[PDB]
Short mmCIF file of C-alpha atoms and ligand atoms in Angstrom, two decimals:
data_model
loop_
_atom_site.label_atom_id
_atom_site.label_comp_id
_atom_site.label_asym_id
_atom_site.label_seq_id
_atom_site.Cartn_x
_atom_site.Cartn_y
_atom_site.Cartn_z
CA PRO A 1 -13.89 -17.67 11.81
CA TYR A 2 -13.57 -14.01 10.74
CA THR A 3 -14.13 -10.86 12.77
CA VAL A 4 -13.77 -7.27 11.55
CA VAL A 5 -13.36 -4.57 14.22
CA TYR A 6 -14.21 -1.17 12.81
CA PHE A 7 -16.15 2.04 13.32
CA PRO A 8 -19.75 2.07 12.02
CA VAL A 9 -18.78 3.29 8.53
CA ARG A 10 -18.05 1.62 5.20
CA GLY A 11 -14.72 3.40 4.79
CA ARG A 12 -11.71 1.09 4.63
CA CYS A 13 -13.76 -2.05 5.31
CA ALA A 14 -16.21 -1.75 2.41
CA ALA A 15 -14.06 -3.71 -0.07
CA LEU A 16 -13.10 -6.56 2.28
CA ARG A 17 -16.77 -6.84 3.31
CA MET A 18 -17.90 -7.00 -0.35
CA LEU A 19 -15.23 -9.66 -0.86
CA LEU A 20 -16.37 -11.73 2.13
CA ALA A 21 -20.05 -11.47 1.14
CA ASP A 22 -19.50 -12.23 -2.54
CA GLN A 23 -17.32 -15.20 -1.59
CA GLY A 24 -20.04 -16.56 0.67
CA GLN A 25 -17.97 -16.15 3.82
CA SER A 26 -19.39 -15.63 7.30
CA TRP A 27 -17.93 -12.96 9.55
CA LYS A 28 -18.62 -11.14 12.80
CA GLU A 29 -18.77 -7.35 12.96
CA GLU A 30 -17.39 -5.79 16.14
CA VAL A 31 -18.60 -2.19 15.99
CA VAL A 32 -16.44 0.44 17.68
CA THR A 33 -18.19 3.65 18.70
CA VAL A 34 -16.38 6.98 18.90
CA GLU A 35 -16.97 6.89 22.67
CA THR A 36 -15.25 3.52 23.01
CA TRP A 37 -12.45 4.65 20.70
CA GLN A 38 -11.88 7.86 22.66
CA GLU A 39 -11.58 5.87 25.88
CA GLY A 40 -8.12 4.93 24.60
CA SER A 41 -7.50 1.30 25.60
CA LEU A 42 -8.57 -0.30 22.30
CA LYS A 43 -6.54 2.18 20.22
CA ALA A 44 -3.50 1.55 22.42
CA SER A 45 -3.68 -2.21 21.76
CA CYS A 46 -3.88 -1.66 17.98
CA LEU A 47 -0.49 -2.15 16.29
CA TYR A 48 -0.57 1.21 14.49
CA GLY A 49 -3.19 2.75 16.77
CA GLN A 50 -5.88 2.36 14.12
CA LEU A 51 -8.74 0.27 12.79
CA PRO A 52 -9.74 -1.94 11.06
CA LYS A 53 -8.52 -4.81 13.15
CA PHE A 54 -9.21 -8.24 11.67
CA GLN A 55 -9.22 -11.69 13.20
CA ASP A 56 -8.97 -14.97 11.33
CA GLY A 57 -8.95 -17.57 14.08
CA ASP A 58 -6.08 -16.47 16.32
CA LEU A 59 -4.38 -14.53 13.54
CA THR A 60 -4.84 -10.83 14.25
CA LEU A 61 -4.23 -8.44 11.37
CA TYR A 62 -4.18 -4.67 10.96
CA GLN A 63 -4.08 -2.64 7.71
CA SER A 64 -7.02 -2.87 5.30
CA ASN A 65 -4.83 -3.91 2.35
CA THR A 66 -3.20 -6.60 4.46
CA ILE A 67 -6.65 -7.99 5.21
CA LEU A 68 -7.52 -7.80 1.51
CA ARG A 69 -4.33 -9.60 0.47
CA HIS A 70 -4.78 -12.19 3.21
CA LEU A 71 -8.32 -13.05 2.10
CA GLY A 72 -7.12 -12.96 -1.50
CA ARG A 73 -4.27 -15.36 -0.74
CA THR A 74 -6.40 -17.76 1.34
CA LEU A 75 -9.53 -17.56 -0.84
CA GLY A 76 -7.74 -17.79 -4.20
CA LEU A 77 -8.45 -14.23 -5.33
CA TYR A 78 -4.85 -13.25 -6.10
CA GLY A 79 -4.32 -14.17 -9.75
CA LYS A 80 -3.60 -17.52 -11.42
CA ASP A 81 0.17 -17.09 -11.34
CA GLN A 82 2.99 -14.77 -10.24
CA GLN A 83 2.61 -12.41 -13.19
CA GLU A 84 -1.10 -11.91 -12.43
CA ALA A 85 -0.38 -11.58 -8.70
CA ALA A 86 1.99 -8.71 -9.52
CA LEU A 87 -0.60 -7.05 -11.79
CA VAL A 88 -3.21 -7.49 -9.07
CA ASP A 89 -0.80 -5.71 -6.72
CA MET A 90 -0.23 -2.93 -9.27
CA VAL A 91 -3.98 -2.36 -9.49
CA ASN A 92 -4.46 -2.39 -5.72
CA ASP A 93 -1.60 0.02 -5.12
CA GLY A 94 -3.19 2.35 -7.66
CA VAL A 95 -6.56 2.04 -5.91
CA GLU A 96 -4.88 2.76 -2.56
CA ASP A 97 -3.16 5.86 -3.98
CA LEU A 98 -6.47 7.32 -5.16
CA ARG A 99 -8.22 6.21 -1.96
CA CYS A 100 -5.69 8.24 0.05
CA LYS A 101 -6.41 11.33 -2.05
CA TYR A 102 -10.15 10.73 -1.63
CA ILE A 103 -9.78 10.36 2.14
CA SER A 104 -7.61 13.49 2.22
CA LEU A 105 -10.33 15.45 0.41
CA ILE A 106 -13.17 14.10 2.58
CA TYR A 107 -11.40 14.80 5.89
CA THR A 108 -8.94 17.58 5.02
CA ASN A 109 -10.60 20.02 2.61
CA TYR A 110 -13.86 18.89 1.10
CA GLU A 111 -15.32 22.36 0.56
CA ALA A 112 -12.32 24.15 -0.91
CA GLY A 113 -10.79 21.18 -2.71
CA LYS A 114 -13.78 19.33 -4.15
CA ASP A 115 -13.86 21.17 -7.48
CA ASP A 116 -10.15 20.66 -8.14
CA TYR A 117 -10.40 17.03 -7.10
CA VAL A 118 -13.27 16.42 -9.51
CA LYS A 119 -11.51 18.10 -12.45
CA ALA A 120 -8.54 15.82 -11.70
CA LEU A 121 -10.68 12.67 -11.39
CA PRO A 122 -10.73 11.70 -15.11
CA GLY A 123 -6.93 11.46 -15.16
CA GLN A 124 -6.99 9.36 -11.97
CA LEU A 125 -9.60 6.95 -13.37
CA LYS A 126 -8.07 6.54 -16.85
CA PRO A 127 -5.42 4.05 -15.69
CA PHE A 128 -8.09 1.55 -14.58
CA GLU A 129 -10.01 1.99 -17.84
CA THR A 130 -6.72 1.31 -19.65
CA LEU A 131 -6.02 -1.82 -17.56
CA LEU A 132 -9.52 -3.07 -18.42
CA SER A 133 -9.00 -2.34 -22.14
CA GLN A 134 -5.86 -4.49 -22.08
CA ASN A 135 -7.61 -7.42 -20.43
CA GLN A 136 -10.06 -9.22 -22.74
CA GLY A 137 -11.51 -5.87 -23.80
CA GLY A 138 -12.67 -5.23 -20.25
CA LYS A 139 -15.25 -8.02 -20.51
CA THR A 140 -14.00 -9.89 -17.45
CA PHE A 141 -12.03 -8.61 -14.45
CA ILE A 142 -9.34 -6.04 -13.75
CA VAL A 143 -6.64 -8.73 -14.01
CA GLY A 144 -6.99 -12.10 -15.72
CA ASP A 145 -10.24 -14.03 -15.99
CA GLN A 146 -10.91 -14.68 -12.30
CA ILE A 147 -11.98 -12.16 -9.67
CA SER A 148 -9.27 -10.84 -7.34
CA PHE A 149 -9.16 -8.81 -4.14
CA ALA A 150 -8.17 -5.82 -6.29
CA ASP A 151 -11.54 -6.06 -8.07
CA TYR A 152 -13.46 -5.49 -4.82
CA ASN A 153 -11.13 -2.68 -3.85
CA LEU A 154 -11.44 -1.02 -7.26
CA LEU A 155 -15.22 -1.53 -7.29
CA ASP A 156 -15.54 0.24 -3.94
CA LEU A 157 -13.31 3.09 -5.12
CA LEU A 158 -15.52 3.50 -8.20
CA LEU A 159 -18.77 3.27 -6.19
CA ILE A 160 -17.72 5.98 -3.72
CA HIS A 161 -16.51 8.24 -6.51
CA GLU A 162 -19.88 7.88 -8.23
CA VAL A 163 -21.39 9.35 -5.06
CA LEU A 164 -18.75 12.10 -4.93
CA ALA A 165 -19.01 12.96 -8.61
CA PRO A 166 -22.21 11.56 -10.17
CA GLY A 167 -21.51 10.58 -13.76
CA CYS A 168 -17.71 10.48 -13.42
CA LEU A 169 -17.79 7.02 -15.05
CA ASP A 170 -19.72 8.17 -18.14
CA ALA A 171 -16.47 8.96 -19.94
CA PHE A 172 -15.33 5.40 -19.21
CA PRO A 173 -17.46 2.69 -20.92
CA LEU A 174 -15.30 -0.19 -19.63
CA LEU A 175 -15.31 0.98 -15.98
CA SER A 176 -19.06 1.70 -16.14
CA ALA A 177 -19.82 -1.72 -17.61
CA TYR A 178 -17.38 -3.24 -15.10
CA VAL A 179 -19.17 -1.62 -12.16
CA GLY A 180 -22.60 -2.70 -13.43
CA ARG A 181 -21.33 -6.23 -14.04
CA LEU A 182 -19.64 -6.83 -10.66
CA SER A 183 -22.48 -5.14 -8.78
CA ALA A 184 -24.79 -7.64 -10.49
CA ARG A 185 -23.01 -10.71 -9.04
CA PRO A 186 -25.82 -12.36 -6.95
CA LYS A 187 -24.25 -12.40 -3.48
CA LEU A 188 -22.63 -8.99 -3.97
CA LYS A 189 -25.89 -7.51 -5.29
CA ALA A 190 -27.73 -8.84 -2.22
CA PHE A 191 -25.03 -7.46 0.12
CA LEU A 192 -24.99 -4.02 -1.53
CA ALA A 193 -28.77 -3.83 -1.10
CA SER A 194 -28.71 -4.96 2.55
CA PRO A 195 -29.20 -2.56 5.52
CA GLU A 196 -25.79 -3.79 6.69
CA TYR A 197 -24.23 -1.87 3.82
CA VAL A 198 -26.89 0.69 2.87
CA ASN A 199 -27.42 2.08 6.38
CA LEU A 200 -23.74 2.66 7.02
CA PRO A 201 -22.25 6.04 6.07
CA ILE A 202 -19.42 5.97 3.52
CA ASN A 203 -17.22 8.14 5.75
CA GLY A 204 -17.03 9.07 9.42
CA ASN A 205 -17.53 12.84 9.06
CA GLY A 206 -20.77 12.67 7.11
CA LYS A 207 -19.21 13.88 3.85
CA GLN A 208 -19.29 12.00 0.54
CA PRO B 1 16.69 -9.57 -16.59
CA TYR B 2 15.70 -6.62 -14.36
CA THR B 3 15.56 -2.93 -15.18
CA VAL B 4 14.53 -0.11 -12.85
CA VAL B 5 13.54 3.20 -14.47
CA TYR B 6 13.72 6.03 -11.95
CA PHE B 7 15.00 9.53 -11.27
CA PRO B 8 18.56 9.82 -9.92
CA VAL B 9 17.48 9.58 -6.27
CA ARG B 10 17.20 6.77 -3.73
CA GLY B 11 13.60 7.63 -2.85
CA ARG B 12 11.11 4.86 -3.58
CA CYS B 13 13.72 2.58 -5.21
CA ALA B 14 16.15 2.37 -2.29
CA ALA B 15 14.49 -0.69 -0.70
CA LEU B 16 14.05 -2.72 -3.90
CA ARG B 17 17.67 -1.90 -4.82
CA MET B 18 18.92 -3.07 -1.41
CA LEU B 19 16.83 -6.21 -1.93
CA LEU B 20 18.26 -6.90 -5.40
CA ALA B 21 21.85 -6.28 -4.25
CA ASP B 22 21.58 -8.32 -1.06
CA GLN B 23 19.99 -11.16 -3.03
CA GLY B 24 22.85 -11.13 -5.52
CA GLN B 25 20.65 -10.09 -8.43
CA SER B 26 21.82 -8.14 -11.46
CA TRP B 27 19.80 -5.21 -12.73
CA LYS B 28 20.01 -2.30 -15.15
CA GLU B 29 19.41 1.28 -14.01
CA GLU B 30 17.66 3.52 -16.52
CA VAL B 31 18.14 7.00 -15.13
CA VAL B 32 15.46 9.58 -15.92
CA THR B 33 16.50 13.21 -15.72
CA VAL B 34 14.08 15.99 -14.83
CA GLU B 35 14.56 17.31 -18.40
CA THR B 36 13.52 13.99 -19.92
CA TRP B 37 10.62 13.71 -17.47
CA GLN B 38 9.38 17.21 -18.25
CA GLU B 39 9.37 16.41 -21.96
CA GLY B 40 6.19 14.45 -21.20
CA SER B 41 6.27 11.33 -23.38
CA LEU B 42 7.74 8.94 -20.79
CA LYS B 43 5.33 10.11 -18.06
CA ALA B 44 2.41 9.68 -20.46
CA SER B 45 3.34 6.05 -21.10
CA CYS B 46 3.55 5.31 -17.36
CA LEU B 47 0.37 3.62 -16.06
CA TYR B 48 -0.14 6.12 -13.23
CA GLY B 49 2.05 8.81 -14.76
CA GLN B 50 4.83 8.10 -12.30
CA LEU B 51 8.10 6.27 -11.65
CA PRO B 52 9.57 3.86 -10.72
CA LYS B 53 8.86 1.67 -13.71
CA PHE B 54 10.24 -1.86 -13.46
CA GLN B 55 10.90 -4.50 -16.06
CA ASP B 56 11.35 -8.21 -15.42
CA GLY B 57 11.72 -9.71 -18.86
CA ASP B 58 8.63 -8.52 -20.72
CA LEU B 59 6.68 -7.98 -17.49
CA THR B 60 6.39 -4.23 -16.91
CA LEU B 61 5.43 -3.11 -13.42
CA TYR B 62 4.65 0.21 -11.76
CA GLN B 63 4.26 0.95 -8.02
CA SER B 64 7.27 0.52 -5.73
CA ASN B 65 5.42 -1.85 -3.38
CA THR B 66 4.27 -3.94 -6.34
CA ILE B 67 7.90 -4.30 -7.39
CA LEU B 68 8.85 -5.20 -3.80
CA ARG B 69 6.11 -7.83 -3.55
CA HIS B 70 6.96 -9.20 -6.98
CA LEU B 71 10.64 -9.70 -6.10
CA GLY B 72 9.55 -11.06 -2.73
CA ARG B 73 7.19 -13.53 -4.37
CA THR B 74 9.67 -14.65 -7.05
CA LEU B 75 12.77 -14.60 -4.81
CA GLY B 76 11.17 -16.29 -1.81
CA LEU B 77 11.23 -13.26 0.50
CA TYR B 78 7.53 -13.32 1.42
CA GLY B 79 7.30 -15.50 4.51
CA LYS B 80 7.30 -19.29 4.92
CA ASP B 81 3.51 -19.57 4.89
CA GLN B 82 0.27 -17.61 4.53
CA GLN B 83 0.29 -16.39 8.12
CA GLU B 84 3.79 -14.94 7.70
CA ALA B 85 2.90 -13.52 4.28
CA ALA B 86 0.06 -11.61 5.94
CA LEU B 87 2.35 -10.35 8.71
CA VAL B 88 4.89 -9.33 6.10
CA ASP B 89 2.11 -7.36 4.42
CA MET B 90 1.11 -5.77 7.72
CA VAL B 91 4.68 -4.58 8.25
CA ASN B 92 5.04 -3.26 4.70
CA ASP B 93 1.72 -1.39 4.85
CA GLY B 94 2.92 0.21 8.09
CA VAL B 95 6.22 1.17 6.46
CA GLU B 96 4.32 2.63 3.50
CA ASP B 97 2.10 4.67 5.82
CA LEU B 98 5.09 6.26 7.53
CA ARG B 99 6.93 6.66 4.22
CA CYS B 100 3.98 8.72 2.92
CA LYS B 101 4.15 10.99 5.96
CA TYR B 102 7.92 11.31 5.49
CA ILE B 103 7.50 12.18 1.81
CA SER B 104 4.76 14.66 2.71
CA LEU B 105 7.11 16.36 5.19
CA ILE B 106 10.07 16.41 2.78
CA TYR B 107 8.09 17.84 -0.15
CA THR B 108 5.18 19.63 1.51
CA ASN B 109 6.41 21.39 4.66
CA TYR B 110 9.88 20.48 5.82
CA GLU B 111 10.64 23.76 7.55
CA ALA B 112 7.40 24.34 9.42
CA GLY B 113 6.53 20.69 10.07
CA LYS B 114 9.89 19.08 10.89
CA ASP B 115 9.72 19.67 14.66
CA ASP B 116 6.19 18.25 14.97
CA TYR B 117 7.10 15.31 12.78
CA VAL B 118 10.12 14.50 14.94
CA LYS B 119 8.17 14.70 18.22
CA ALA B 120 5.67 12.27 16.64
CA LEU B 121 8.39 9.89 15.36
CA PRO B 122 8.75 7.74 18.53
CA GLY B 123 5.07 6.77 18.37
CA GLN B 124 5.44 5.94 14.66
CA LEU B 125 8.50 3.76 15.25
CA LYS B 126 7.20 1.91 18.33
CA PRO B 127 5.05 -0.52 16.30
CA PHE B 128 8.11 -1.91 14.51
CA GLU B 129 10.01 -2.25 17.79
CA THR B 130 6.99 -4.14 19.15
CA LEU B 131 6.83 -6.43 16.10
CA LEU B 132 10.53 -7.20 16.61
CA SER B 133 9.98 -7.89 20.33
CA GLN B 134 7.34 -10.46 19.42
CA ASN B 135 9.56 -12.26 16.95
CA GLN B 136 12.39 -14.22 18.62
CA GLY B 137 13.21 -11.22 20.79
CA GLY B 138 14.09 -9.23 17.68
CA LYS B 139 17.17 -11.37 17.10
CA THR B 140 16.20 -12.29 13.54
CA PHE B 141 13.93 -10.48 11.09
CA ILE B 142 10.78 -8.38 11.20
CA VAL B 143 8.67 -11.49 10.44
CA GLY B 144 9.72 -15.09 10.89
CA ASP B 145 13.29 -16.33 10.64
CA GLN B 146 13.95 -15.55 6.97
CA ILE B 147 14.42 -12.13 5.39
CA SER B 148 11.43 -10.66 3.55
CA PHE B 149 10.83 -7.72 1.23
CA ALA B 150 9.34 -5.90 4.22
CA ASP B 151 12.76 -6.05 5.93
CA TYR B 152 14.42 -4.06 3.15
CA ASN B 153 11.56 -1.60 3.09
CA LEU B 154 11.64 -1.17 6.87
CA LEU B 155 15.46 -0.91 6.86
CA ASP B 156 15.33 1.91 4.32
CA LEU B 157 12.63 3.70 6.32
CA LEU B 158 14.82 3.46 9.43
CA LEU B 159 17.96 4.57 7.57
CA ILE B 160 16.33 7.70 6.12
CA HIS B 161 14.79 8.60 9.47
CA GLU B 162 18.22 8.34 11.08
CA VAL B 163 19.32 11.06 8.65
CA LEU B 164 16.18 13.13 9.37
CA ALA B 165 16.38 12.72 13.14
CA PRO B 166 19.85 11.52 14.25
CA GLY B 167 19.48 9.27 17.28
CA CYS B 168 15.76 8.56 16.77
CA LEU B 169 16.55 4.84 17.14
CA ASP B 170 18.35 5.21 20.49
CA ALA B 171 15.11 4.68 22.41
CA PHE B 172 14.64 1.45 20.44
CA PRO B 173 17.26 -1.24 21.20
CA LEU B 174 15.67 -3.85 18.93
CA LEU B 175 15.33 -1.53 15.90
CA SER B 176 18.87 -0.18 16.44
CA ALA B 177 20.35 -3.69 16.66
CA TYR B 178 18.18 -4.72 13.71
CA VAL B 179 19.52 -1.87 11.57
CA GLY B 180 23.13 -2.63 12.50
CA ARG B 181 22.59 -6.34 11.85
CA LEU B 182 20.94 -6.07 8.40
CA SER B 183 23.33 -3.33 7.30
CA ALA B 184 26.14 -5.77 8.14
CA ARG B 185 24.95 -8.45 5.69
CA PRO B 186 27.94 -8.71 3.26
CA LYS B 187 26.30 -7.88 -0.06
CA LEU B 188 24.06 -5.22 1.49
CA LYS B 189 27.01 -3.67 3.35
CA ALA B 190 28.96 -3.49 0.08
CA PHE B 191 25.98 -1.97 -1.75
CA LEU B 192 25.33 0.63 0.96
CA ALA B 193 28.99 1.67 0.76
CA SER B 194 29.01 1.88 -3.05
CA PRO B 195 28.93 5.19 -5.01
CA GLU B 196 25.78 3.82 -6.65
CA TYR B 197 24.00 4.31 -3.36
CA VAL B 198 26.14 6.84 -1.52
CA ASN B 199 26.28 9.44 -4.30
CA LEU B 200 22.53 9.46 -4.88
CA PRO B 201 20.44 11.96 -2.90
CA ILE B 202 17.76 10.48 -0.62
CA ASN B 203 15.11 12.81 -2.06
CA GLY B 204 14.62 14.88 -5.20
CA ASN B 205 14.38 18.30 -3.58
CA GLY B 206 17.66 18.12 -1.67
CA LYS B 207 16.00 17.82 1.73
CA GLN B 208 16.55 14.98 4.21
N1 GSH C 301 -3.33 2.27 6.47
C1 GSH C 301 -4.43 1.94 7.41
C2 GSH C 301 -5.23 3.20 7.75
C3 GSH C 301 -6.21 2.99 8.88
C4 GSH C 301 -6.97 4.23 9.27
O1 GSH C 301 -6.77 5.31 8.72
N2 GSH C 301 -7.81 4.08 10.28
C5 GSH C 301 -8.63 5.18 10.77
C6 GSH C 301 -10.08 4.95 10.34
S1 GSH C 301 -10.28 4.46 8.60
C7 GSH C 301 -8.54 5.19 12.29
O2 GSH C 301 -8.34 4.15 12.91
N3 GSH C 301 -8.73 6.36 12.88
C8 GSH C 301 -8.66 6.48 14.32
C9 GSH C 301 -7.31 7.00 14.80
O3 GSH C 301 -6.39 7.18 13.97
O4 GSH C 301 -7.19 7.26 16.01
C10 GSH C 301 -5.33 0.90 6.76
O5 GSH C 301 -5.27 0.80 5.52
O6 GSH C 301 -6.06 0.19 7.48
N1 GSH C 302 2.61 4.92 -5.23
C1 GSH C 302 3.73 5.15 -6.19
C2 GSH C 302 4.26 6.58 -6.05
C3 GSH C 302 5.23 6.96 -7.14
C4 GSH C 302 5.71 8.39 -7.07
O1 GSH C 302 5.33 9.16 -6.19
N2 GSH C 302 6.53 8.76 -8.04
C5 GSH C 302 7.09 10.09 -8.11
C6 GSH C 302 8.57 10.04 -7.72
S1 GSH C 302 8.91 9.06 -6.23
C7 GSH C 302 6.96 10.59 -9.53
O2 GSH C 302 6.95 9.80 -10.47
N3 GSH C 302 6.89 11.90 -9.68
C8 GSH C 302 6.76 12.48 -11.00
C9 GSH C 302 5.33 12.84 -11.33
O3 GSH C 302 4.44 12.56 -10.51
O4 GSH C 302 5.11 13.44 -12.40
C10 GSH C 302 4.85 4.16 -5.90
O5 GSH C 302 4.85 3.62 -4.78
O6 GSH C 302 5.68 3.91 -6.79
#
């Protein structure tokens, strides 16, 4: 089946977990403590010396976006055709870009850079609002009329930014509605309310 | 047909260009000067306010990796099956990770951070050598026995690092052979020797 090896944080596994849960998939969580990580052996065996590590049967994957694309490809959450698959990629790459900036802030200069980051946020979120406006008036998903792996990734990005900058989505009616809508999907809603998700910190350094 | 809108640099378009050329595809280059960029209108119309911008018929794409995956998907350079597609993704994500560090060095702190970056290089390259060692002894491609978009992306990464740190591939027989082998592919070889490629700077700030 599936197994996700990660530290006890939502971080880069939040989206793939939301995906798995919403899609009714079963998976095993192999929690890696800082102690175990610092020992060195596990890290050494990781392709790029990092987590998450994912296992689908005997297929071992690394890279959160690889895991997302894999599940998307195998679970049919990658568009209806090639054009949509490309658009799904375009959205995900955008999410990744902002996620990297977020991570940089959180771990590199939260205190000094938070204000600047927040002033810049609107411009970083606008693209997704625009994508939504061009897709059935933002009444469905980020791309096409079926959910994709990019949706879960974008939803997580939006959720964590809501924590970082409460109200940041107020200026974006489509994104706000979108978040409320996806969060309301039965299985996802249940997962987001579970201790499994709720009792895990967003990041590893206690900042958010 | 195809059209790539970018600044007159290899940068993030080098891999997709190598791909297009090696695959015998025809494409139009729409060069964007710093003057034109600074005007503001073009940037404003770009989804994430950045280039490259790519056009395939009336399909407009943004994000270099999206373009790479799109061409890979439509040109059959994305693995033979889902398992390979995932591995191809894992390689590309790794390449992207190192490319971001490279770009950060080049534009953020070349002078002060070059030495540290270079000492760290071996550890950053090892994963690709390992991937090669696990795939037909590195006699073929990065994943499987057919070329993928990740190959062009990895090749570019290796080529630019050779310029940054001459000899960095000496400790890696598989990567070295791999570079020599792919660079020898007829169409690619011709492209790499063309003014189109040769007379374009690797980066926009003149560093490399
Ligand atoms: N590009 C990778 C990044 C992975 C990453 O940054 N992993 C961090 C935690 S989220 C890690 O393993 N840190 C431990 C280390 O680098 O030693 C991905 O998307 O999975
Ligand atoms: N994640 C994007 C990054 C694009 C990017 O960084 N573009 C730069 C040049 S390589 C740019 O457009 N700079 C101009 C600007 O940001 O205003 C991609 O992979 O295409």
